[PDB]
Amino acid sequence: EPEQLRKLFIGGLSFETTDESLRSHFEQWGTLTDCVVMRDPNTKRSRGFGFVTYATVEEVDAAMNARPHKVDGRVVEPKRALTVKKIFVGGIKEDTEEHHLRDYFEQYGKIEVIEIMTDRGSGKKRGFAFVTFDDHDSVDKIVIQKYHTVNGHNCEVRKAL
C-alpha cells in the first residue's frame, strides 16, 4: 500500500515522548517502518506531535481500533491521511433504503444517523443521503477508497460540512 495510507499523525504528545517511546507504544499494533517525534531544530524541545508508519493498512486499522492511546501518561490524538464525522453519499437514486446504507457503512464505524434526502415539496427521494458516525476515523477510511458500491450503485462519497 502507498506509504501515505500507512501513516498515523499523532497529536497531543507529552513533551517527554521520544522516538523510542512512541515506537515501543505503537509497535503493539504492527510493524513500524518509521516513527518520529517532531522537535524544534534549535532547542530540540518536542513540538508535541509526531508520526508513525506501519507496514500495512490493516495495522493502521488495528492501532486506530485500540484508541484511546495513553502514551507516556497522556492521551494522544492519532489521525490518518478536515476532521468530521459525517459523509455525503450521492448517486443512490430512488431505490436505495436505510438498510442498504447501514449494512455497508456499519463496517466502517458505528453509525448514529442515516438521513435519506427527500424533496421538500413532493417527498420523492432525491438520490443522496448523509451518514453520521460516532468518530472521524470511519469517515477517513471511507473517503480514501476509490470506489463505493451500495445497492448495485457506484456512489460518490465525500466529507460533509
Ligand X SMILES: CC(=O)N1CCN(CCCc2ccccc2)CC1
Note whether 38 binds ligand X by CB under 6 A. Answer: yes
What is the biggest distance separating any 2 CA atoms in the chain, rounded to whole angstroms?
Answer: 65
CB of 45 to ligand X, least distance (A): 16
Peptide bond into 68 cis (omega under 30): yes
Gap between the Cα atoms of 97 and 108, Å rounded: 18
Q: Quick one: which segment of 27-35, 45-53, 63-71, 124-132 binds ligand X (CB under 6 A)? A: 45-53
Whichever of 20 and 112 has its CB closer to ligand X, that residue is 20
CA-closest candidate to residue 12, choices 68, 72, 77: 77
Gap between the Cα atoms of 5 and 12, Å rounded: 21
Total of chain residues touching ligand X, rule CB under 6 A:
7
Note whether 9 binds ligand X by CB under 6 A. Answer: yes
Q: Quick one: which segment of 47-55, 63-71, 90-98, 141-149 binds ligand X (CB under 6 A)? A: 47-55
Q: Contact positions toward ligand X, by CB under 6 A?
A: 9, 38, 49-51, 81-82
